Amino acid sequence: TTIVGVKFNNGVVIAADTRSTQGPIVADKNCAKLHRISPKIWCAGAGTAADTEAVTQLIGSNIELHSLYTSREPRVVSALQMLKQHLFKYQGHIGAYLIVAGVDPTGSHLFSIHAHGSTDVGYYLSLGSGSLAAMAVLESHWKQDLTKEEAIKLASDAIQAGIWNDLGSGSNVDVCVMEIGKDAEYLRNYLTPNVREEKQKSYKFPRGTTAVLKESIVNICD
Amino acid sequence: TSIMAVTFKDGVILGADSRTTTGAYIANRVTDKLTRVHDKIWCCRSGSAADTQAIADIVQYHLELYTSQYGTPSTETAASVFKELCYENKDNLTAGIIVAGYDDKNKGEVYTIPLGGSVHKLPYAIAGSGSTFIYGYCDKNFRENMSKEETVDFIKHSLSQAIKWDGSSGGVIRMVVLTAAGVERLIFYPDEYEQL
């Protein structure tokens, strides 16, 4: 997995690849690593797929209840604090590595959370197996005062570095742009540079090829 | 990591490198290892990033609740709360913390808390992997009742050597000045401190 976060003047952008693996086998060629904690707080997850999804949904649920209780739009630091306290409690046994980003009344924010419960602040971050490929691109091209269109380009370029050079990462690039004073736009399959080429042959079998012992109608109704 | 706190005439100064490592990979090259637990009580964090953040967050909570009830806590009180967490959970924590604060009665004070959870009050303290390389230098060069500029130089030259020799230390040198005047943040970039 390759996930990045990039800050620009009026917001923050997070991107991710779409490959899920079971050992050396690709389980999902187009899985979604970008999770909505709250409408304007989004999360990118690497590590144990279930752990990143479960911890994202739990804090997302508690943040919604907190938002309704306080009659206030949720803050990134709240999601960050609740996540890192939960992850610390389980002493790294919940294998969730997350880039938490969003806009709130306080402004735009970008954090990373490691499974043991450490948090980092930055203008650009990368996590996962392809983080070193991505961080190489970020360290080469990142500058202060990026525009929206520049930050999307930099973020997607950093993911592509992971897709091509890291065996853990591949397929497509998902992006989410969180700009201040605007609705967050989730760009599912923003880039699809790994389309499967036309097969040489159709393997559609002549009907009756498979040998059958028994047939029966199944009753699904009451 | 390379961290130190030094007492001087006007108060105390905290210094640290800016590098966080997993193995030989630098996870964060602009880490802030100088963290506020009260207006004029700060700490330097070394060891597990996760463990030191969890401890610092709890201590900040305890001192905020202390302040609500009994007013401003002493630097000794802050060190005692750090010790209590570190000592009672010694089996599950890897955290070497230097506690530094400015009272108006007690002036600048430095307490070091190694792995054991023991407390040691010192004129200055050094800790982290990079500290080993500057015991000789710091012992020979440290004087009591230094000026601000002298103490900033002492810390800059000390961490400069620690960074040079230790692979685990690097990036910028952050410092935090604690005096009656208030709280001042200082940063020093490689291009300056490397060629000292």
Binding site: - | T20, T22, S48, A49, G128
Partner: peptide
């Protein structure tokens, strides 16, 4: 296993 981030260290400082």
């Amino acid at each position: 296993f981030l260290w400082x």
